[PDB]
Amino acid sequence: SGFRKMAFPSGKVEGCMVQVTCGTTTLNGLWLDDVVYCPRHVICTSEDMLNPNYEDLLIRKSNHNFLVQAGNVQLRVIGHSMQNCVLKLKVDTANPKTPKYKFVRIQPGQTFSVLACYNGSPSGVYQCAMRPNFTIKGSFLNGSCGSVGFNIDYDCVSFCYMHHMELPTGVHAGTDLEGNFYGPFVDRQTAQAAGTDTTITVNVLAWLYAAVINGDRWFLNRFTTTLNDFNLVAMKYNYEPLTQDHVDILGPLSAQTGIAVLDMCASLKELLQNGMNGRTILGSALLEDEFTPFDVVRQCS
Amino acid sequence: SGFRKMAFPSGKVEGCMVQVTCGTTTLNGLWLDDVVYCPRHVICTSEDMLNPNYEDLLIRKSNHNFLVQAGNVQLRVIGHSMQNCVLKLKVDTANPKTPKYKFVRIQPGQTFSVLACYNGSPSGVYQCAMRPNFTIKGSFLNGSCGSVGFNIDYDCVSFCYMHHMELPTGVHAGTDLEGNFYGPFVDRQTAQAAGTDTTITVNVLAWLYAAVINGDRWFLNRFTTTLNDFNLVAMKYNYEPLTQDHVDILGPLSAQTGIAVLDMCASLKELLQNGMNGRTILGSALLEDEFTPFDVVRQCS
Ligand SMILES: *[C@](O)(C(=O)NC1CCCC1)[C@H](C[C@@H]1CCNC1=O)NC(=O)[C@@H]1[C@H]2CCC[C@H]2CN1C(=O)[C@@H](NC(=O)C(F)(F)F)C1CCCCC1
Ligand SMILES: *[C@](O)(C(=O)NC1CCCC1)[C@H](C[C@@H]1CCNC1=O)NC(=O)[C@@H]1[C@H]2CCC[C@H]2CN1C(=O)[C@@H](NC(=O)C(F)(F)F)C1CCCCC1
Secondary structure, three states: OOOOOOEOOOHHHHOOEEEEEEOOEEEEEEEEOOEEEEEHHHHOOOOHHHOOOHHHHHHOOOHHHEEEEEOOEEEOEEEEEEEOOEEEEEEOOOOOOOOOEEEOOOOOOOEEEEEEEEOOEEEEEEEEEOOOOOOEOOOOOOOOOOOEEEEEEOOEEEEEEEEEEEOOOOOEEEEOOOOOEOOOOOOOOOOOOOOOOOEOHHHHHHHHHHHHHOOOOOOOOOOOOOHHHHHHHHHHHOEOOOOHHHHHHOHHHHHHHOOOHHHHHHHHHHHHHHOOOOOOEOOEOOOOOOOOHHHHHHHHO | OOOOOOEOOOHHHHOOEEEEEEOOEEEEEEEEOOEEEEEHHHHOOOOHHHOOOHHHHHHOOOHHHEEEEEOOEEEOEEEEEEEOOEEEEEEOOOOOOOOOEEEOOOOOOOEEEEEEEEOOEEEEEEEEEOOOOOOEOOOOOOOOOOOEEEEEEOOEEEEEEEEEEEOOOOOEEEEOOOOOEOOOOOOOOOOOOOOOOOEOHHHHHHHHHHHHHOOOOOOOOOOOOOHHHHHHHHHHHOEOOOOHHHHHHOHHHHHHHOOOHHHHHHHHHHHHHHOOOOOOEOOEOOOOOOOOHHHHHHHHO
């Protein structure tokens, strides 16, 4: 039945995307009820960005310094406040398309959908993982700032990411919707570096189970192993240690396939030690770590 | 800035997805104006599907044999007709969320976004290519039938795919919105086979340009080649021949990077002849053929 990098349907979030302008700076905002959330660096000039004092920069602004456009209609700003690295703009109209929503802070290894936006206009949607080093491997150009990441459980949108910056390795960094950065990054145009990344082991194992459920079995073997002996090989290949919490989460997939977790661990070990020898798994020549156990169950129903 | 398999925002299509039930068969339909489009096999029992006569099966049905649910509201059917492999259900309410739309039949090598749907509820969105053998490498379970594929240009949705079936290789087949199958497939549970697939050469070249635009340059070389000598190596690696039409389409990417098309061809030749030697391009260990030149320009702005 097949296995694809699948994003959440983006309709509930499209209806919240607006354009926020302050002087010559234009980026994207999220309009929920009578509040528009955007990156605070909207109030910055090129010069300010080298070493901004945001509190100073903001006390020098008024409501009228902020143009908020929902498509054609201009929303009148009637209030502003900063929360960490996000600006909150109180507007005179509650968004009639406000979905059921929450603000959630995701953990490294968890996945979410990104709605790339330019000038408040949705451009595309794709799935990302919060990397262990708190970066995301996104696709973001100038104008993307204020684009959000989200999960949809039932009809409730859980917002977990707002886009702020690109690092020199070509990966991306931003905040939760309360304005707290993921990882040790700051909203200043200064030399900053992604820390060394690791492979999300539990997600590789989840993807191996997805493979089996779709009829790729070539990489399986009769062997098993212990959490301990497996984790020695993980250490060696720059893979996150696997925990009992990780084995427990892989349970439903373990049952559905009848392959024990520590049996599937023995498969990963041999793949790590010998490579794939010109073969592929779910159309990849690399071990994929951007599917969670939940993503695999969800998609393989 | 990064490169991702990116789907169109799915909002305009979510607002068109309905559930169609006929007896015990439930699948998805597309509600545009006062018409609901769905797979004609909705009128089939398990038994009928082994060798249906659809004309017969349909003449034995009335408007009242079709329950159409848009979320919680039931739409009253006031007409029905078959067009090839699609059923058209005239309903008593024009869809207030009908976007600007077209029905288009796409060519092999072209891409589109799929909104996977179950019980008329959007489940996920992802990008697909119409393969040269007229299959798509989708992710579709029982209940997916009636799920649509589409491109969005300006605010106009061009619908190009409706889902009908899975082939034994685990790839998928269906129709345009006028009910004509892509490829030599029929809507009957009988032994049918995907033909041998080729790699979309123009899309691999487009993806190499995307690579250069994002700073992957390792695979470039000083050499060039001719269309003919390149096509000799394409033949050998099960790659579609490249045409002047393909070279012309790659022009804007050729210009933007200053790498001539036949220069980038000499790179593909060496990648085909010697492989990648443990290196990756845009995070893939395989040559990717599901990005069009348009997809690369659009995303790499
Ligand atoms: C974002 O602000 C944006 O989209 N703003 C638009 C409105 C005004 C101009 C465009 C922008 C998004 C990135 C641009 C390229 N790809 C992106 O994802 N972010 C930034 O430009 C961001 C600002 C805001 C906080 C810090 C500064 C600098 N910055 C960066 O992304 C830079 N990164 C760094 O300085 C650092 F080293 F990572 F810290 C990039 C440096 C290379 C060139 C592109 C920007
Ligand atoms: C689709 O009709 C559906 O979703 N309908 C729902 C309502 C009733 C039950 C589910 C369904 C979608 C596929 C099922 C698995 N994944 C899919 O993409 N299509 C079919 O089942 C389709 C019907 C309609 C036209 C032909 C028959 C048979 N069929 C198939 O997909 C089978 N393929 C073939 O018979 C053939 F060889 F390709 F010709 C599949 C065979 C094995 C896998 C399950 C069905």
